[PDB]
Nucleic acid binder design. Structure first.
Ligand SMILES: Cc1cn([C@H]2CC[C@@H](COP(=O)(O)OP(=O)(O)OP(=O)(O)O)O2)c(=O)[nH]c1=O
Ligand SMILES: [Mg+2]
Ligand code: NA
Length: 361
DNA sequence: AAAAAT
C-alpha cells in the first residue's frame, strides 16, 4: 500500500513515532561502534539502514516486510532476521560488551572529550572516569574540567520544560540588546523531541549594524556572567566569507555554553520531585548569522544529522548543487540561490517540503 | 600546536 521509499532522508517523512525501535536501537549501536573505531563507510551503511526503518509507518514483523526497502544490505538483513527470531541482536550485545566501545562511550560522554582524547586514555589503560579524574600525570583542558565538574547534570538529558525555560532566558537576554532580533530554538526540540543533550538557538537581526551583530553574543554572555548564570563559555568569532563556494562546523559566530538553570524558572507540571541544589547545568548553543543567510542556517541547525547529510548528498548527486549552512550554489547556472525561508530552499532543490517534525531521520 | 565544541 505504501509509496516507493527514497534512499534519501530528505525525500522521506520521519516522525518521532518509531515502530521499529528494536531494529533501530541495534543498528544505532553498531553505527556508533564503527564511528568510534573510525570506519566511515560501514557506520554509514548502518546509519542509512537505521534511518530508513525510522521512516516506516509500520513495524517489521517478517523478512517479507523488508522487500522494496532501500539501504538494507545483506549484512543489515541478517541483523533484522536475528531480531525477528528472539527480539534481540547478538551483534549489538557483543558491541555493548566490547571494552573499546564501553570506554569510548564513557570517555566521549564528558564535555570536552572527543575521539582523540578517548583513544589516548584507552591506549594508556584507563577504563573508568574515576581513575582518569584522580590521575596525577594527566592535564585537562578548561572544557574537560567543566565536563567533569558538571558531568551528572550534563549526562542527564534536557527535557522540554527545561528547553522552554532556556528559550525564555535567551529571548529576554537577546531582546535587551537587539529588540528587532529573531530568536529560534533549533535542533531536536524544533523537530518536536521531548529530550536533548543540549538546547540550540539561531539569532539574526534585520537592521543590526556589522558591529551590533558581532557584539551581541558578547553582550548576552556578559549579561549572564553578571547574574552568575554563565558556568562555561567559549565564543567562536565568524570565519564566514560571503563569496566562497559551500565546499563539519559552519563559519558563523557561535558560542558553546553551560548555563546555570534555576529550577524556579522551569514550569515542570511534575510533582513529587526533590529540588536538591535548586539548579541544573544545561549545555546551550547560540548561533549569530547575517540576516540574508537565516534560512540556510535554520535548515542546517534544525537537523537531524542524517536529514542534513542526505540533503547535501541529494543536492550534489541529483541536482549538481552545493549546499551547506551558509548558501546553496547551482553549478549548472553558475549562480548562488537566495532564500527567505526553508520552503524556498526545498523549492530550489526540487524537493517536496518536509516540516521540521518530519525531519527525524 | 591538535583538539573540542554543531
Ligand atoms: C553534531 C552535528 C550536528 N549537525 C546539525 C544537525 C542537528 C544540529 C544540532 O546539533 P545536535 O547534535 O545537538 O543535534 P540534535 O538533533 O538536536 O540532537 P540531540 O537531541 O541534542 O542529541 O546540528 C550536523 O549537521 N552534523 C553533526 O555532526
Ligand atoms: Mg541539540
Ligand atoms: Na564529549
Amino acid at each position: 500500500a505504501v509509496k516507493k521509499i527514497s534512499q534519501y532522508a530528505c525525500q522521506r517523512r520521519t516522525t518521532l513515532n518509531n515502530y521499529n525501535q528494536l531494529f533501530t536501537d541495534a543498528l544505532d549501536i553498531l553505527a556508533e561502534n564503527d564511528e568510534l573505531r573510525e570506519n566511515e563507510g560501514s557506520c554509514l551503511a548502518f546509519m542509512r539502514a537505521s534511518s530508513v526503518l525510522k521512516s516506516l509507518p509500520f513495524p517489521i514483523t517478517s523478512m517479507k516486510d523488508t522487500e522494496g526497502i532501500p539501504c538494507l544490505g545483506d549484512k543489515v538483513k541478517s541483523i533484522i532476521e536475528g531480531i525477528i527470531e528472539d527480539g534481540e541482536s547478538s551483534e549489538a550485545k557483543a558491541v555493548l560488551n566490547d571494552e573499546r566501545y564501553k570506554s569510548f562511550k564513557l570517555f566521549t560522554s564528558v564535555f570536552g572529550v572527543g575521539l582523540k582524547t578517548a583513544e589516548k586514555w584507552f591506549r594508556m589503560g584507563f577504563r573508568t572516569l574515576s581513575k582518569i579524574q584522580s590521575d596525577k600525570s594527566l592535564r585537562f583542558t578548561q572544557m574537560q574540567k567543566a565536563g567533569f565538574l558538571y558531568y551528572e547534570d550534563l549526562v542527564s538529558c534536557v527535557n522540554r520544560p527545561e528547553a522552554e525555560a532556556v528559550s525564555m532566558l535567551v529571548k529576554e537576554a537577546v531582546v535587551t540588546f537587539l529588540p528587532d532580533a529573531l530568536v529560534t530554538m533549533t535542533g531536536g526540540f524544533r523537530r518536536g523531541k521531548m529530550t536533548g543533550h543540549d538546547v540550540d538557538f539561531l539569532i539574526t537581526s534585520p537592521e543590526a549594524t556589522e558591529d551590533e551583530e558581532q557584539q551581541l553574543l558578547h553582550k548576552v554572555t556578559d549579561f549572564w556572567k553578571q547574574q552568575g548564570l554563565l558556568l562555561y563559555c567559549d565564543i567562536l568569532e565568524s570565519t564566514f566569507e560571503k563569496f566562497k563556494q559551500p565546499s563539519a562546523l559552519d563559519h558563523f559566530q557561535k558560542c558553546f555554553l553551560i548555563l546555570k538553570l534555576d529550577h524556579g524558572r522551569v514550569h515542570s507540571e511534575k510533582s513529587g520531585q526533590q529540588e536538591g541544589k535548586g539548579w541544573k547545568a544545561i549545555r546551550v548553543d547560540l548561533v549569530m548569522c547575517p540576516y540574508d543567510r537565516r534560512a540556510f542556517a535554520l535548515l542546517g541547525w534544525t537537523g537531524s544529522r542524517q536529514f542534513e547529510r542526505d540533503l547535501r548528498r541529494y543536492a550534489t548527486h541529483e541536482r549538481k548543487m552545493m549546499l551547506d549552512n551558509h548558501a546553496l550554489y547551482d553549478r549548472t547556472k553558475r549562480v548562488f540561490l537566495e532564500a527567505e525561508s526553508e520552503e524556498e530552499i526545498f523549492a530550489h532543490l526540487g524537493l517536496d517540503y518536509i516540516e521540521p517534525w518530519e525531519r527525524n531521520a
